[PDB]
Amino acid sequence: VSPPPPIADEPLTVNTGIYLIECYSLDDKAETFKVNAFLSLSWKDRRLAFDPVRSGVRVKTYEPEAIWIPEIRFVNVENARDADVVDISVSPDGTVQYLERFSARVLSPLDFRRYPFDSQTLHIYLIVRSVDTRNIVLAVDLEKVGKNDDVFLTGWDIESFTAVVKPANFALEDRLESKLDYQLRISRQYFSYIPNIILPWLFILFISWTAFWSTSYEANVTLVVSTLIAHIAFNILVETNLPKTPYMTYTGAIIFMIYLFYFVAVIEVTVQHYLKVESQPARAASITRASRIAFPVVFLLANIILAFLFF
Amino acid sequence: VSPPPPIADEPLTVNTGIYLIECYSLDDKAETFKVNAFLSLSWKDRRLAFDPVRSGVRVKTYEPEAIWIPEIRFVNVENARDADVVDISVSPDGTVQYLERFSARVLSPLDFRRYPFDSQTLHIYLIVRSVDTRNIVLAVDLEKVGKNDDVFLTGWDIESFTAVVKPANFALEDRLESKLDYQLRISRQYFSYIPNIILPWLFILFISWTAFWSTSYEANVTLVVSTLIAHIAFNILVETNLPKTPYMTYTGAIIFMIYLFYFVAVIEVTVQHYLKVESQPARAASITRASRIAFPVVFLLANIILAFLFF
Amino acid sequence: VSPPPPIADEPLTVNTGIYLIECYSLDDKAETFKVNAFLSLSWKDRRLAFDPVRSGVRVKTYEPEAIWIPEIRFVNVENARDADVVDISVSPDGTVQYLERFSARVLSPLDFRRYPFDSQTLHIYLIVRSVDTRNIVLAVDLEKVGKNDDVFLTGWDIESFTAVVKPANFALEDRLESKLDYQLRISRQYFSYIPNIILPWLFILFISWTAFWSTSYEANVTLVVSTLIAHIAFNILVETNLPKTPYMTYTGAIIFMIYLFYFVAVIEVTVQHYLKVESQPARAASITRASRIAFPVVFLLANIILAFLFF
Amino acid sequence: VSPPPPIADEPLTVNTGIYLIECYSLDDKAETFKVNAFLSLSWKDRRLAFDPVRSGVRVKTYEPEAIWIPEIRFVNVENARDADVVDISVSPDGTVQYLERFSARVLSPLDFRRYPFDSQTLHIYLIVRSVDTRNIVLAVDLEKVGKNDDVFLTGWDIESFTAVVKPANFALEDRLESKLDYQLRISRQYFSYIPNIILPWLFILFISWTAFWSTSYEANVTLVVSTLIAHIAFNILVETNLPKTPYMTYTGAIIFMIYLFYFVAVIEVTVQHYLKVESQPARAASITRASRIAFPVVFLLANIILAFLFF
Amino acid sequence: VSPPPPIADEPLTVNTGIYLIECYSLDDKAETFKVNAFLSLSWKDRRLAFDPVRSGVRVKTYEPEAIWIPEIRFVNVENARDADVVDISVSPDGTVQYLERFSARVLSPLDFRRYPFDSQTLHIYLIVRSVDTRNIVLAVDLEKVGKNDDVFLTGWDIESFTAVVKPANFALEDRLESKLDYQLRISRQYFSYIPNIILPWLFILFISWTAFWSTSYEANVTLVVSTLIAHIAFNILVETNLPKTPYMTYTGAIIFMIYLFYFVAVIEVTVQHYLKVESQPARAASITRASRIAFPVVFLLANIILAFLFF
Ligand SMILES: CC(C)c1cccc(C(C)C)c1O
Ligand SMILES: CC(C)c1cccc(C(C)C)c1O
Ligand SMILES: CC(C)c1cccc(C(C)C)c1O
Ligand SMILES: CC(C)c1cccc(C(C)C)c1O
Ligand SMILES: [Cl-]
Ligand SMILES: [Cl-]
Ligand SMILES: [Cl-]
Ligand SMILES: [Cl-]
Ligand SMILES: [Cl-]
Ligand SMILES: [Cl-]
Ligand SMILES: [Cl-]
Ligand code: NA
Ligand code: NA
Ligand code: NA
Ligand code: NA
Ligand code: NA
Ligand code: NA
């Protein structure tokens, strides 16, 4: 077996097509997602052409080893796909219709800048190295590109599974390579985040702000310090499900901002007490009365400023 | 090897049948379950038919490679099943009786809306792509569908393992596909949840409500704040064993409701103290006396409201 | 290759024998254990019989593919065993002596009712599906059943590795199956549990009971509440190493009982303070003086009651 | 292929030799370590002997399948080694020189009695089951036993990789087996343990002992109780990296001893307060003044007693 | 198949070349990184010479099994690489051009001394054992050494992927070995570390230092002790992502230094209170006033001293 000879000096076009059957295990920290899909391939091999009237049969079936099949690989994969050949059908003109069912862990980076309101574009790159005899070029057969209705990615909404029709043909190690981009657009389901993380956080922060309606230093310390323990607990819980980004994220910004609001609250609590011990509660109550309005107002404005900057 | 030619122009019926040997590893967060089972297949291949009189033997055994076997796959699987062919027996009329023993991690979504008092219907989808020569249609042989008595799924009660007799025949990538549904009904064992999680929770919440029989702000802060740490501990413990649902769960609802009861308790504790410092304990004791009855009554009613909305 | 023809109509007896080489990875939560062992098999195949005088050799060696070997499988396994054929020796009478070295993760349920003073009986089920030609029946060759002396299962004491000599012959999917039970009795090493978990727990509980020799509500709250945080820490630590049981466990019972002792201690602390504020320390000191004796006495008796009910 | 016939009735000696290339993943809890090494084997097969003059070549290379190779296995392995045959060279006298490169997870128990100042002797057991024709006996070729200089086991110092020259020849299932011991001596790098675990622990314990220079029960409770939370945190951190030992460990002993020092400190704090409330601070200050010296002195002596008993 | 005979008595030069396609999963604790790359190999096999006029092709293709291919292995790998042969092209002179696509988890040690401002040099060692017929020597073909632009290692900046052109030819087990070094230089992205870890637990440390503007022992204990709980939380979080180093790390040094600052702060708080109780607040306030300046100044200087010693 060797590649099919060219009629003129034109390159061999291979008609790709990925159809998602199962989409699962999107690891955010690892920036990986598992996929079980159908891989369709089609090319013209004139050596396999036959007369349908004399042969009697309209379509001829072949075993993978019997005929020449292009060596198609995935770029962004951890290991080589677990492929199972479904069918190889040859038309009278010599057009081969290959179909396999594969499974592979795909390495696709994620942008956590707008987390957990973020949307992602997952990539699946198909590639083919051109042989010495002739050059191989990939093509998208839009009829054979899609996903099944049941396909569910836990905690995400699957928008579209499209493919960049024009391949990126480039030189690599003195040989031509044709690369195709399969884009899977997904948007995060941010419902759960509000009653489970966002609201209980705010509640623990508001509990700290009750120290503005108290003159008891001992109780204020117990309030602001203990609520900070709850803050650390919640901060650790989030950053464990997120990778170390060289960029600032929307959550990371708020997370950091709350740490400042706790530090400044401690300073307030410390100042309030220092003045009361120094016998000037007129100054202490005026600062505390200001902080009653200041802390939520500045927090509300700073959040608007952040949400802007990020959205 | 090629498919058996049709008498007439009727499609090939393949008689399926799954018999569960082992059912284990139900990952709730991953929405997967592992299964070790028997897969029975039966079809008529007239090319394999023989006369039992001259042959001598009533049955004829074959190696998988020797005869045509339909390419049967599972839809909702992570990877291709680890199958081991047990037996291939051919009757004189040409009826093939295939039997294999497989193991596969099955991707079946779970509805956590009524967790941990929830029940689930696990699915196992059998599929076959129809060849060019003739169309392949799946069928359920109810005699060969079941589970062994020992089959145990830790923390669950196995109700029934049935199969939707009528296959879902549809078109996919210009070829017919016959899909069968194997339903495994299971209900959660919610015993452990009461003494381990539900009761100790309530106890830590009741401990926070002892602040209604105390006028000591320092002790009340220490009461309501520290019990909130215990609440956060138990909240994190539950939501780690559950995936991020776009829908509200029965547990999630109570979990959120307790966070409110803690926030309102802090407001009470703050108000009670503010009035005492402002020299009006008549107002403070009246609010505290009301909260002694209010907090459990509202909590008891709100739980009935939630349980009614979910069950 | 086909099964050996039966003299008269008797079933084929296959002489099994498992010899444990390595026993490791007992996952309590998963109810699984890994095993590396020897699997011996012996049957009479009269077609392989020879004369030792003319052949010169007393024993004839064969490759697995060359002769008929019975399809022996394990029932309670996650996946098919990783077997390596050690030796196949044939005697002049046609008696085949098969020996393989395998490794498989065995699914054996555990009874945590008496944890950590519990003992377990691990099972390894050998099975053989009877062919059309003749019925296959398993048998135990007690000479080839055992374990090596070095075999160590971390945190457990290996009592005995025996086998139920009489197989459980039953019908399944219109074919006979012969099932054998290999029992591995193990008892837990409960030393570590006393100084690491049992005693430090008791210490944190006794620390809470020092609130019976104190009239300071602020200090009593700090005592009983903070020690409850330590209790939650230790409770979480244990239930993470144990699966969700539909039955009550010995540990789970004590775990729950301590939660009650903490709740009742809070009620005492609350009552004591309420009476002191209400100006009646005669009633408060009398209740506290009673609780000094009551709490350890009731705890000691309730533990005897539990230990009696469980052992 | 069959074993080489004996000249006289002597057993076949196979010259073993393990050369470590990579040594990694020492799991303390699992009592396993991974190894990537060279396995050399040498035996005399007179059937393969040739004349170097007539043949023209002084050495003959063979494919594994072409010649008889002894079935060498590892005793203490999870699964069969991932071997790759490097070279098979035959000398004119029939001496075969086999060399393979393998990788296997080795099951070697560890003695945690002196942890983290403990040293371990890791074992790699080579075995061969004697065939019918003749008995196979293993031998150490010390020239082919070693490790590469780069070989690094994270957190350990590799002392020596030696082999017990005399094999342990024994009977098993009526056949002789020759077992060889390959010992890898390693000692723990206990540096990190001092500034990371040992010193911060002591610091949190000394912080608890500041309650001996205070008469404030409320502050003393806050001191001894909160520092106990830090103790529990640090105790859990260590015992998670260590398996459940039926024997007492050096760390476990100290860990338990500190729990007692916390319990006794609480009793002191409780007694001190009881006497002050009972109006006798002369008795309370005398006990507290004694405890200032008693606690560190008894702790320092008890540690010397333990270190002696263990080292 | 055997090695190609030498023209004169020169060794066989094999032209290596690694081209990284995917670089992922850098486990810091395990000191491993996964890589998906192209492995190019080129050697002259004069036996494979052909006349393109007679052959009909200028470049002849071969299956791996058909021709002699050098046994190239990786030194620092966990297991044998998952290789897939892309192309084998032979020119009329007999120059073989081998290309495979592999994936392997590479064992490369990391120096955590300057963590997280540390840079690393990852190694990939190619090796070939010389056969008895002739010696094999590796060579770098710099044209076929590189990485793709998309190659992303999460949390790291990929500097350069170079190769030490001169191989390390040495003797091992009486045979020559040619070893090549492939160096992948990477530097850590230390941005995330500042707002997520560095700043929040400078904030928790400063919160403890507010005890210098307070004379309330009860509040000071609650301050310094509770902030120490936050410190322990943050210490455990870091050392879990780092392996046990026999050397001191930059982070480990600061981590330890903060533990001292907490211990000394407790001593201050204890001394301050002892003098107040002993009726000498002039001495107590003077020490506290000094500590207000002392603690940040000493901390700032000690950090400069550490940063100088490490960088
Ligand atoms: C991860 C998620 C639950 C989360 C927590 C805290 C804050 C935010 C936003 C609102 C900034 C958030 O997205
Ligand atoms: C999921 C489970 C552990 C749980 C947590 C919280 C509340 C409930 C019910 C009782 C409302 C619950 O069952
Ligand atoms: C799980 C383990 C640490 C444990 C905790 C509590 C009680 C017990 C026995 C005595 C029932 C126990 O072994
Ligand atoms: C591990 C990392 C987040 C970290 C913790 C604490 C201190 C430092 C530097 C500032 C020394 C640090 O880099
Ligand atoms: Cl691929
Ligand atoms: Cl499948
Ligand atoms: Cl099996
Ligand atoms: Cl092995
Ligand atoms: Cl013996
Ligand atoms: Cl023998
Ligand atoms: Cl390799
Ligand atoms: Na082919
Ligand atoms: Na077939
Ligand atoms: Na066979
Ligand atoms: Na061989
Ligand atoms: Na080859
Ligand atoms: Na407190």
Short mmCIF file of C-alpha atoms in Angstrom, two decimals, chain C residues 17 19 21-25 34 36 38 40 58-59 61 82 84-87 89 99 101 103 144 148 150 152 154-155 189 191-193 195-197 199-200 203-204 206-207 210 213-216 218-220 222-223 226-227 229-230 233-234 237 241 292, chain D residues 29-31 71 73-80 105 107-109 125 127 129 131-133 170 172-175 177 179 217-218 221-222 225-226 228-229 232 235-236 239-240 243-248 252 255-256 259-260 262-263 266-267 270 273-274 277:
data_model
loop_
_atom_site.label_atom_id
_atom_site.label_comp_id
_atom_site.label_asym_id
_atom_site.label_seq_id
_atom_site.Cartn_x
_atom_site.Cartn_y
_atom_site.Cartn_z
CA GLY C 17 -6.48 -24.12 43.28
CA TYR C 19 -2.20 -19.81 45.90
CA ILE C 21 1.58 -14.59 46.38
CA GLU C 22 0.67 -10.94 47.16
CA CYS C 23 -2.36 -9.46 48.90
CA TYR C 24 -2.61 -5.65 48.97
CA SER C 25 -4.70 -2.44 48.50
CA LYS C 34 -6.01 -6.40 44.98
CA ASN C 36 -1.47 -11.44 42.85
CA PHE C 38 -1.34 -18.67 41.27
CA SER C 40 -3.92 -24.12 39.11
CA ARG C 58 6.88 -39.21 31.28
CA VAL C 59 5.49 -35.63 30.94
CA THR C 61 4.61 -29.86 27.66
CA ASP C 82 -3.87 -10.12 34.10
CA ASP C 84 0.57 -15.14 32.52
CA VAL C 85 0.77 -18.90 31.77
CA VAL C 86 3.53 -20.48 33.93
CA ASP C 87 3.24 -24.18 32.85
CA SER C 89 2.12 -30.36 31.75
CA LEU C 99 -0.76 -23.16 36.08
CA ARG C 101 0.01 -16.34 37.59
CA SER C 103 -3.49 -10.28 39.27
CA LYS C 144 -2.98 -26.50 45.53
CA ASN C 148 2.74 -17.62 51.06
CA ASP C 150 5.19 -13.23 53.60
CA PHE C 152 0.83 -9.05 54.27
CA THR C 154 -1.47 -3.60 55.84
CA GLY C 155 -3.54 -3.01 59.00
CA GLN C 189 -5.44 -4.48 63.72
CA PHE C 191 -4.04 -0.95 68.11
CA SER C 192 -3.30 2.39 66.31
CA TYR C 193 -6.98 3.45 66.82
CA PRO C 195 -3.73 6.34 71.02
CA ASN C 196 -4.43 8.10 67.68
CA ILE C 197 -8.23 8.43 67.59
CA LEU C 199 -8.02 8.55 73.47
CA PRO C 200 -7.55 12.10 71.93
CA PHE C 203 -9.59 14.03 75.98
CA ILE C 204 -11.37 16.73 73.87
CA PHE C 206 -13.43 15.65 78.93
CA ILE C 207 -12.12 19.20 78.26
CA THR C 210 -14.61 21.10 82.76
CA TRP C 213 -16.47 23.24 87.55
CA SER C 214 -17.06 26.84 86.25
CA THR C 215 -19.80 29.52 86.66
CA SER C 216 -18.34 31.78 83.89
CA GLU C 218 -18.37 33.30 78.60
CA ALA C 219 -15.68 30.66 79.44
CA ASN C 220 -18.22 27.76 79.36
CA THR C 222 -15.73 29.02 74.71
CA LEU C 223 -15.20 25.54 76.26
CA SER C 226 -14.70 25.09 70.67
CA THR C 227 -14.42 21.44 71.80
CA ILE C 229 -15.25 22.11 66.56
CA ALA C 230 -12.59 19.49 67.57
CA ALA C 233 -12.86 17.59 62.96
CA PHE C 234 -12.49 14.02 64.37
CA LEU C 237 -11.77 12.26 59.75
CA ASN C 241 -12.40 6.40 55.56
CA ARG C 292 -20.41 16.69 87.30
CA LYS D 29 1.13 4.77 53.08
CA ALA D 30 0.89 2.15 50.24
CA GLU D 31 4.38 0.65 51.08
CA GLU D 71 10.53 -17.69 32.79
CA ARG D 73 9.23 -13.37 37.52
CA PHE D 74 9.21 -10.89 40.43
CA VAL D 75 7.57 -11.97 43.70
CA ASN D 76 6.69 -8.64 45.37
CA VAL D 77 5.13 -6.84 42.37
CA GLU D 78 1.60 -5.41 41.87
CA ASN D 79 1.48 -6.53 38.20
CA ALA D 80 3.90 -8.16 35.67
CA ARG D 105 5.76 -1.07 41.09
CA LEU D 107 5.53 -3.99 47.09
CA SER D 108 8.09 -3.56 49.92
CA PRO D 109 6.94 -3.08 53.59
CA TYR D 125 12.58 -10.69 44.80
CA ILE D 127 12.00 -16.06 41.16
CA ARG D 129 9.78 -22.14 38.74
CA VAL D 131 10.33 -27.24 34.79
CA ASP D 132 9.69 -31.02 34.50
CA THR D 133 12.74 -31.80 32.39
CA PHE D 170 12.17 -24.16 48.24
CA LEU D 172 5.97 -24.96 46.00
CA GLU D 173 3.04 -26.89 44.41
CA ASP D 174 5.37 -29.99 43.96
CA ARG D 175 7.98 -27.91 42.00
CA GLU D 177 11.56 -22.51 43.05
CA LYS D 179 14.24 -17.03 44.95
CA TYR D 217 -9.67 31.92 83.20
CA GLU D 218 -11.41 33.36 80.09
CA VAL D 221 -9.47 28.74 78.13
CA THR D 222 -8.95 30.75 74.85
CA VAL D 225 -8.34 25.29 73.82
CA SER D 226 -7.40 27.21 70.61
CA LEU D 228 -5.38 22.35 70.87
CA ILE D 229 -7.18 23.12 67.54
CA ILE D 232 -5.33 18.57 66.01
CA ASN D 235 -1.72 15.70 64.16
CA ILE D 236 -4.12 15.03 61.21
CA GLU D 239 -1.01 10.58 60.35
CA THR D 240 -2.43 11.08 56.78
CA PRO D 243 -0.23 4.04 57.39
CA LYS D 244 -2.10 2.48 60.37
CA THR D 245 0.68 0.57 62.17
CA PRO D 246 -0.09 -2.32 64.61
CA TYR D 247 3.06 -1.06 66.47
CA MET D 248 3.73 2.27 68.16
CA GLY D 252 2.80 8.57 67.26
CA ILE D 255 1.73 12.97 69.14
CA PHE D 256 -0.13 11.06 71.94
CA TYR D 259 -2.54 15.26 73.73
CA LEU D 260 -1.93 14.36 77.44
CA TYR D 262 -3.02 19.50 76.66
CA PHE D 263 -5.48 17.53 78.83
CA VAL D 266 -6.80 22.04 80.99
CA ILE D 267 -7.03 20.31 84.43
CA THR D 270 -9.63 24.37 85.75
CA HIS D 273 -9.78 28.91 88.56
CA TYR D 274 -11.78 26.70 91.00
CA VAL D 277 -13.53 31.34 92.79
#
